[PDB]
């Protein structure tokens, strides 16, 4: 009774890979599918060893290991489009390493992932990352502010946003995060109340609101 | 087979079955008539079925409507009670109208009850509205918020687009294949 | 900022002329005195105080005011 | 004039329910004491009055707090309506 | 065969059948008289049928109309109740009239209930109207909004074209071929 | 044969039959006396029949008239109720008169119910009227709107041509040939 | 049992044409008739392959294909008065193509329509189209405005319209659209209240609105 | 086997089983009908089961809703009790609407009861709300707080984002494998 | 028992393609047909391998793969009118590649689509795409603003729009999106309590001055 | 009023009408 025969009718939905530790690794696309598989193993339908894996879980586990043995490495994300040959994106600016060192890193990752035959390390440009973020916000016409730091960029979006703006921001941010991860660029969405509706005010230099005739207010 | 639940309604049974099937648990529905429906599963799946029943807080409860609090028997019911029943009917009729729009699967609607004051002595406050809706897959949500706002704005005497909140979501993936039977 | 508007100007919304022309007094560089009869009138809109004398002259003719300047303060009457 | 309509109708409804309770108690007691005289075939004028008095006094000792709540509520409400326009 | 639902009305059962057939599920309707209608499906289709019953929240609740809140036969009525019965009837009459226009299949109307305040001593607010309608395929919707606005405008003492919202949609593809029976 | 509907009245039955025949569906009407009429169709046509029954929302509801909400056979009648029954009778009598004009097949009329305020202590609003009508093929609709407007204007004490809306349409193609029987 | 025997008693209502792909094409005139035929095929009364077609559906389908392979071709409509020999109207000004290219186009259309023997391409004049539109609106005495763009002309009919006017407009536009389609000329019909809602105002470059006596509002040039 | 608990309800029993299985204690549920459910365990596990029953203060108590303190049984009901039932209905209807959002598993809502004074003769205080919610694993909590605040803001007459509190949590690890039986 | 015999009576509603995967691919027009097909497979009425596909799903999948391996490629959309020979539209301005690189890209795509025999790559002009957008708005007389960025164009339509304007706008946008996709051109439709439909002016001594775009707008006092 | 400058009166008092004329 092979494992593929037990997962269901839709044979396309799952992918079975044999590992060097002689264990079957089942690759899933999402949580719902993950639990659909884990139930079969936990019930004990299959008799040999097997495990269930997905991109998010492996990203987390690998990051935890890097935290211990490479506490200063600047990197983005590991892609499993072809699970047998993952792609690891490193920064070009924030890392200075030799080719030998990179090769060693490659081999240690390969030892952590017994289902992968090799790890391809690719160098990406930070300026590109930041630029595609800011261009995506201008494309959506959101109001925003940009703040720059030595090791990261922060985009602040705040105000009395409309429902169509909240929806657009949410879709965009969620699309970007999947490609780049969350390590270099951060987005902050902050809804605030409206002081101006129904009040007169001066704006530009020397701006002030006035709550009511005879009552001036001077924001900072 | 182990008994999970007894004396369920038809509506509770079909929700429980739907939720267990989604997690690959094969369940059985039995009818006892005046005693209602019973749900059963195999032992290998018992633990999981228990954990899910707790996590989702099944079986579901009955569905609340404000008019249930104010059934009129008096000669004279308060200006509060009458107004409450009125708003509690307009809400339901709007949800039923929205469900007819193109490709909406379900929706819910809420209105600000000014009636938490009788408005004796004090001037009445303007209305606010909120709605939730679920769409078929492949719907341009951004382009479809406009229609709903336009439709609701003119159902009431004083409403501003600023005072209308609309939240939309897509249907999840379809569950078509049957769960596997324990070996 | 609590003032998320880009340019500069004054946004009146149903302002008595007294409270409107006070906002113009700093660009005029003069204190403004307004009669009660004129202070009964109202205005709404978005205004550029770029050249106050030339604005004040025009609004006098549009709103029916009359105005004078003695060197120390501007006086506006119906 | 929905305000005059409301205040006028409520005044009469309040009269009807404030007065009903004592008279209900008095009537039920009256009937039972009238019956007992028939099954006993024994007759006097005073026994029903004597019991009715006690029944009504107990009714008032019990309910009177609620009479105050109801009257204060109505008293405030009508004043606010009278002076509501300003 | 597995039982999905029992004790249905005629017009609930027909809706359930229609929705299952649209997704290629062959279903059967059985009549038990005083017990109502029963619906059955094959086992291979059971899972899918339960998923769709959840997703569409079948069987449908009955239509809600505001007069149900204010029965004609109570001992007494305040003016608010009478006024609500009145508008609750004008809505239904306009819907029944629009269904006679050329090529309209069905429609819904909503009126702003000003009745929720007296407007005594006060200027009564103007009326607002919303309508939804479904058309046969090949109808020039843009050219047909004008007719409906023109018609509704004069149905009330004071209505502005600005205060009338109209939303139109075409009919979906026709379901003519029968679903396939499981092998 | 499969049962679609039971316990229908005569007018509902003939409506359903007409709609099905238009789409090439052969249907049969059966009489059970005190149990009403039943409608049946062949299996090859069952699917389509169900889909059209849903699409048109058959069977039709009873026709609504405002006076139904304010029955005259009641102990006492407020002025609002009497003022309502008067208008709800004038509407019907105008519909019945329009049907007598040359070439008209049917009509609907609506009047602005100013009773929705008492207008005590207030000047009464002017009247507004709306009308819909269906004509025989080959009718000069453009030249026929004038007659209707002229006739309606003098039906009420104060009406302006600007306050009268009129919408006209022609009869659809005749369904004379019988549908084909399934092979 | 031939197919014509299954469509009804009114033999002249439908037209059957054989196609190169070994399929019968039943040409229909309207939606009602289209569904009358489709019910017969979908029930499975006939047993070979057959299809139902009409002019609107075919115009949509062919436009969708042109959108992919000829995304800049300027054209009006395809007429199927004679379904065996359709006529395709192209703009004389807004297209530059050689005779050879037109022939190639013809052959590809013939490949899309297996029931047609040939496609006849005719060149039409834009000035003619626009002139018939404006002459129609004048003849019907409607008030209108004309806007010109590089690629099209737009007629805006708006304001307070009487019932008679609305009826005339709807009839005319429906007539025009069936001849020329909706690609080059668009008619915008919009019922407006009084522009400013019964309020006095001054128009021109110094315009303003009187909200009330003693209350001025300065929204825009008017 | 030793008896832990008797006379439980269905929903007390399932909660007790869930909590003991989580700690690797195999338990058994028995039904006595009118006497309810009974829970039993083996002796080697008795001590532990006792300690957990104490720690979680099982069996759980019935759920509390404010409407349960102000039952509708009076001929005159005081304004304070009417407003209490009103708010106690709105809270529940909002919780039921939140559970329909995308990927929420459970929620709670609380409202500031300004009714502990009648607000007779005193200007009414503004509203405050609090919400708790639990999500599926892998949810961007930060991006989802915005949606909930937006939705709650307009469900009420006058609310500031500064006066809405929201607290979110992810679901715990799934309990799928069965506990081991004592040797 | 072939697959075509199981999908229904209307044979041409679906199309069945063999592929190098040794799996049948079923091509469907829309989601409802997609589910009508998927039910047959998921029920297990067929025994060999099969899959259901549509244009939208394939666009999404391919774009996800390109995001990994060609993260800076500027492109529009892949059309599947003829599913055996899809057409892939690239920008002429924003891409710089050699013929060899294009060939390699083509081959890799062919590897992703085992049902396709070859992929044709076509270069399109951005100026054309933008001009067709703007002219489509003018042809409907919608009020709009245009904003230009390095990599895209945004059209903003906002205010107290009328119901007929909302309808015409959403019909147009839903037609354009199908052809060009949403990557390069974006349309925002927003309803505001504002009667000038997005215009804005300041009053000064010299009269009105048009005010640049911005998030804040003056709500209607009328 | 495509050109020039004028005033659209609606039962306006002469004071508001001649005030509008004052600028010219
Ligand atoms: C409690 C007995 C005296 C109550 C007097 C109430 C007077 C109400 C006057 C208005 C009556 C007519 N109405 C209800 C149409 O206004
Ligand atoms: C025979 C006495 C009649 C008194 C009528 C008024 C009764 C209600 C008000 C007095 C209540 C007195 N109490 C119960 C508070 O002591
Ligand atoms: C002997 C009959 C006396 C009747 C009047 C008694 C005084 C009024 C009642 C005062 C108390 C009212 N209460 C119970 C609400 O406090």
PDB file of N, CA and C in Angstrom, chain F residues 55-98:
ATOM      1  N   UNK F  55     -36.284  30.856 -12.074  1.00  0.00           N
ATOM      2  CA  UNK F  55     -35.932  32.144 -12.650  1.00  0.00           C
ATOM      3  C   UNK F  55     -37.097  33.119 -12.616  1.00  0.00           C
ATOM      4  N   UNK F  56     -38.310  32.654 -12.879  1.00  0.00           N
ATOM      5  CA  UNK F  56     -39.474  33.528 -12.794  1.00  0.00           C
ATOM      6  C   UNK F  56     -40.103  33.595 -11.410  1.00  0.00           C
ATOM      7  N   UNK F  57     -39.606  32.841 -10.437  1.00  0.00           N
ATOM      8  CA  UNK F  57     -40.189  32.837  -9.098  1.00  0.00           C
ATOM      9  C   UNK F  57     -41.655  32.422  -9.085  1.00  0.00           C
ATOM     10  N   UNK F  58     -42.017  31.472  -9.927  1.00  0.00           N
ATOM     11  CA  UNK F  58     -43.374  30.980  -9.932  1.00  0.00           C
ATOM     12  C   UNK F  58     -43.602  30.125  -8.694  1.00  0.00           C
ATOM     13  N   UNK F  59     -44.854  29.950  -8.271  1.00  0.00           N
ATOM     14  CA  UNK F  59     -46.114  30.546  -8.702  1.00  0.00           C
ATOM     15  C   UNK F  59     -46.309  31.976  -8.222  1.00  0.00           C
ATOM     16  N   UNK F  60     -47.110  32.755  -8.934  1.00  0.00           N
ATOM     17  CA  UNK F  60     -47.228  34.175  -8.615  1.00  0.00           C
ATOM     18  C   UNK F  60     -47.951  34.409  -7.299  1.00  0.00           C
ATOM     19  N   UNK F  61     -47.569  35.494  -6.630  1.00  0.00           N
ATOM     20  CA  UNK F  61     -48.220  35.912  -5.402  1.00  0.00           C
ATOM     21  C   UNK F  61     -49.588  36.511  -5.707  1.00  0.00           C
ATOM     22  N   UNK F  62     -50.491  36.531  -4.731  1.00  0.00           N
ATOM     23  CA  UNK F  62     -51.745  37.265  -4.916  1.00  0.00           C
ATOM     24  C   UNK F  62     -51.483  38.750  -5.098  1.00  0.00           C
ATOM     25  N   UNK F  63     -52.365  39.407  -5.842  1.00  0.00           N
ATOM     26  CA  UNK F  63     -52.209  40.830  -6.113  1.00  0.00           C
ATOM     27  C   UNK F  63     -52.537  41.678  -4.883  1.00  0.00           C
ATOM     28  N   UNK F  64     -51.688  42.672  -4.620  1.00  0.00           N
ATOM     29  CA  UNK F  64     -51.780  43.556  -3.454  1.00  0.00           C
ATOM     30  C   UNK F  64     -52.598  44.813  -3.735  1.00  0.00           C
ATOM     31  N   UNK F  65     -53.539  45.127  -2.840  1.00  0.00           N
ATOM     32  CA  UNK F  65     -54.256  46.399  -2.851  1.00  0.00           C
ATOM     33  C   UNK F  65     -54.232  47.045  -1.472  1.00  0.00           C
ATOM     34  N   UNK F  66     -53.991  48.355  -1.454  1.00  0.00           N
ATOM     35  CA  UNK F  66     -53.772  49.080  -0.204  1.00  0.00           C
ATOM     36  C   UNK F  66     -54.925  48.896   0.770  1.00  0.00           C
ATOM     37  N   UNK F  67     -56.158  48.870   0.280  1.00  0.00           N
ATOM     38  CA  UNK F  67     -57.281  48.749   1.201  1.00  0.00           C
ATOM     39  C   UNK F  67     -57.264  47.452   1.995  1.00  0.00           C
ATOM     40  N   UNK F  68     -56.478  46.463   1.583  1.00  0.00           N
ATOM     41  CA  UNK F  68     -56.374  45.231   2.358  1.00  0.00           C
ATOM     42  C   UNK F  68     -55.783  45.467   3.740  1.00  0.00           C
ATOM     43  N   UNK F  69     -54.975  46.509   3.904  1.00  0.00           N
ATOM     44  CA  UNK F  69     -54.353  46.777   5.191  1.00  0.00           C
ATOM     45  C   UNK F  69     -55.272  47.513   6.150  1.00  0.00           C
ATOM     46  N   UNK F  70     -56.344  48.103   5.647  1.00  0.00           N
ATOM     47  CA  UNK F  70     -57.286  48.892   6.441  1.00  0.00           C
ATOM     48  C   UNK F  70     -58.687  48.389   6.153  1.00  0.00           C
ATOM     49  N   UNK F  71     -58.979  47.152   6.533  1.00  0.00           N
ATOM     50  CA  UNK F  71     -60.297  46.590   6.250  1.00  0.00           C
ATOM     51  C   UNK F  71     -61.405  47.474   6.775  1.00  0.00           C
ATOM     52  N   UNK F  72     -62.440  47.610   5.955  1.00  0.00           N
ATOM     53  CA  UNK F  72     -63.604  48.403   6.304  1.00  0.00           C
ATOM     54  C   UNK F  72     -64.481  47.693   7.317  1.00  0.00           C
ATOM     55  N   UNK F  73     -64.484  46.364   7.302  1.00  0.00           N
ATOM     56  CA  UNK F  73     -65.260  45.584   8.261  1.00  0.00           C
ATOM     57  C   UNK F  73     -64.512  45.454   9.589  1.00  0.00           C
ATOM     58  N   UNK F  74     -64.405  46.583  10.276  1.00  0.00           N
ATOM     59  CA  UNK F  74     -63.689  46.669  11.536  1.00  0.00           C
ATOM     60  C   UNK F  74     -64.464  47.633  12.416  1.00  0.00           C
ATOM     61  N   UNK F  75     -64.251  47.542  13.725  1.00  0.00           N
ATOM     62  CA  UNK F  75     -65.151  48.244  14.628  1.00  0.00           C
ATOM     63  C   UNK F  75     -65.038  49.749  14.470  1.00  0.00           C
ATOM     64  N   UNK F  76     -63.823  50.268  14.363  1.00  0.00           N
ATOM     65  CA  UNK F  76     -63.602  51.700  14.229  1.00  0.00           C
ATOM     66  C   UNK F  76     -62.441  51.938  13.283  1.00  0.00           C
ATOM     67  N   UNK F  77     -62.468  53.094  12.637  1.00  0.00           N
ATOM     68  CA  UNK F  77     -61.559  53.415  11.550  1.00  0.00           C
ATOM     69  C   UNK F  77     -61.069  54.829  11.783  1.00  0.00           C
ATOM     70  N   UNK F  78     -59.770  54.968  11.954  1.00  0.00           N
ATOM     71  CA  UNK F  78     -59.180  56.276  12.099  1.00  0.00           C
ATOM     72  C   UNK F  78     -59.276  57.056  10.791  1.00  0.00           C
ATOM     73  N   UNK F  79     -59.251  58.378  10.876  1.00  0.00           N
ATOM     74  CA  UNK F  79     -59.221  59.192   9.661  1.00  0.00           C
ATOM     75  C   UNK F  79     -58.149  58.778   8.684  1.00  0.00           C
ATOM     76  N   UNK F  80     -56.962  58.435   9.159  1.00  0.00           N
ATOM     77  CA  UNK F  80     -55.919  57.974   8.256  1.00  0.00           C
ATOM     78  C   UNK F  80     -56.387  56.772   7.448  1.00  0.00           C
ATOM     79  N   UNK F  81     -57.034  55.820   8.107  1.00  0.00           N
ATOM     80  CA  UNK F  81     -57.544  54.641   7.417  1.00  0.00           C
ATOM     81  C   UNK F  81     -58.606  54.989   6.382  1.00  0.00           C
ATOM     82  N   UNK F  82     -59.575  55.823   6.743  1.00  0.00           N
ATOM     83  CA  UNK F  82     -60.579  56.204   5.749  1.00  0.00           C
ATOM     84  C   UNK F  82     -59.963  56.953   4.572  1.00  0.00           C
ATOM     85  N   UNK F  83     -59.049  57.867   4.856  1.00  0.00           N
ATOM     86  CA  UNK F  83     -58.383  58.637   3.823  1.00  0.00           C
ATOM     87  C   UNK F  83     -57.527  57.758   2.936  1.00  0.00           C
ATOM     88  N   UNK F  84     -57.170  56.576   3.417  1.00  0.00           N
ATOM     89  CA  UNK F  84     -56.400  55.619   2.635  1.00  0.00           C
ATOM     90  C   UNK F  84     -57.297  54.801   1.722  1.00  0.00           C
ATOM     91  N   UNK F  85     -58.373  54.250   2.272  1.00  0.00           N
ATOM     92  CA  UNK F  85     -59.323  53.504   1.453  1.00  0.00           C
ATOM     93  C   UNK F  85     -59.892  54.327   0.303  1.00  0.00           C
ATOM     94  N   UNK F  86     -60.135  55.617   0.504  1.00  0.00           N
ATOM     95  CA  UNK F  86     -60.610  56.417  -0.626  1.00  0.00           C
ATOM     96  C   UNK F  86     -59.645  56.378  -1.817  1.00  0.00           C
ATOM     97  N   UNK F  87     -58.374  56.683  -1.585  1.00  0.00           N
ATOM     98  CA  UNK F  87     -57.392  56.673  -2.669  1.00  0.00           C
ATOM     99  C   UNK F  87     -57.232  55.288  -3.261  1.00  0.00           C
ATOM    100  N   UNK F  88     -57.183  54.277  -2.416  1.00  0.00           N
ATOM    101  CA  UNK F  88     -57.026  52.938  -2.938  1.00  0.00           C
ATOM    102  C   UNK F  88     -58.232  52.475  -3.725  1.00  0.00           C
ATOM    103  N   UNK F  89     -59.359  53.166  -3.641  1.00  0.00           N
ATOM    104  CA  UNK F  89     -60.432  52.846  -4.575  1.00  0.00           C
ATOM    105  C   UNK F  89     -60.360  53.661  -5.863  1.00  0.00           C
ATOM    106  N   UNK F  90     -59.934  54.918  -5.780  1.00  0.00           N
ATOM    107  CA  UNK F  90     -59.791  55.707  -7.003  1.00  0.00           C
ATOM    108  C   UNK F  90     -58.759  55.104  -7.947  1.00  0.00           C
ATOM    109  N   UNK F  91     -57.634  54.634  -7.413  1.00  0.00           N
ATOM    110  CA  UNK F  91     -56.635  53.972  -8.254  1.00  0.00           C
ATOM    111  C   UNK F  91     -57.237  52.858  -9.101  1.00  0.00           C
ATOM    112  N   UNK F  92     -57.931  51.939  -8.451  1.00  0.00           N
ATOM    113  CA  UNK F  92     -58.529  50.814  -9.150  1.00  0.00           C
ATOM    114  C   UNK F  92     -59.563  51.258 -10.174  1.00  0.00           C
ATOM    115  N   UNK F  93     -60.352  52.276  -9.857  1.00  0.00           N
ATOM    116  CA  UNK F  93     -61.344  52.694 -10.839  1.00  0.00           C
ATOM    117  C   UNK F  93     -60.703  53.363 -12.048  1.00  0.00           C
ATOM    118  N   UNK F  94     -59.549  53.999 -11.884  1.00  0.00           N
ATOM    119  CA  UNK F  94     -58.879  54.525 -13.071  1.00  0.00           C
ATOM    120  C   UNK F  94     -58.272  53.412 -13.912  1.00  0.00           C
ATOM    121  N   UNK F  95     -57.619  52.439 -13.285  1.00  0.00           N
ATOM    122  CA  UNK F  95     -57.132  51.305 -14.066  1.00  0.00           C
ATOM    123  C   UNK F  95     -58.246  50.711 -14.915  1.00  0.00           C
ATOM    124  N   UNK F  96     -59.378  50.420 -14.279  1.00  0.00           N
ATOM    125  CA  UNK F  96     -60.498  49.849 -15.009  1.00  0.00           C
ATOM    126  C   UNK F  96     -61.035  50.763 -16.087  1.00  0.00           C
ATOM    127  N   UNK F  97     -60.850  52.073 -15.978  1.00  0.00           N
ATOM    128  CA  UNK F  97     -61.313  52.896 -17.088  1.00  0.00           C
ATOM    129  C   UNK F  97     -60.325  52.873 -18.241  1.00  0.00           C
ATOM    130  N   UNK F  98     -59.034  52.998 -17.951  1.00  0.00           N
ATOM    131  CA  UNK F  98     -58.027  52.911 -19.006  1.00  0.00           C
ATOM    132  C   UNK F  98     -58.176  51.654 -19.838  1.00  0.00           C
TER     133      UNK F  98
END
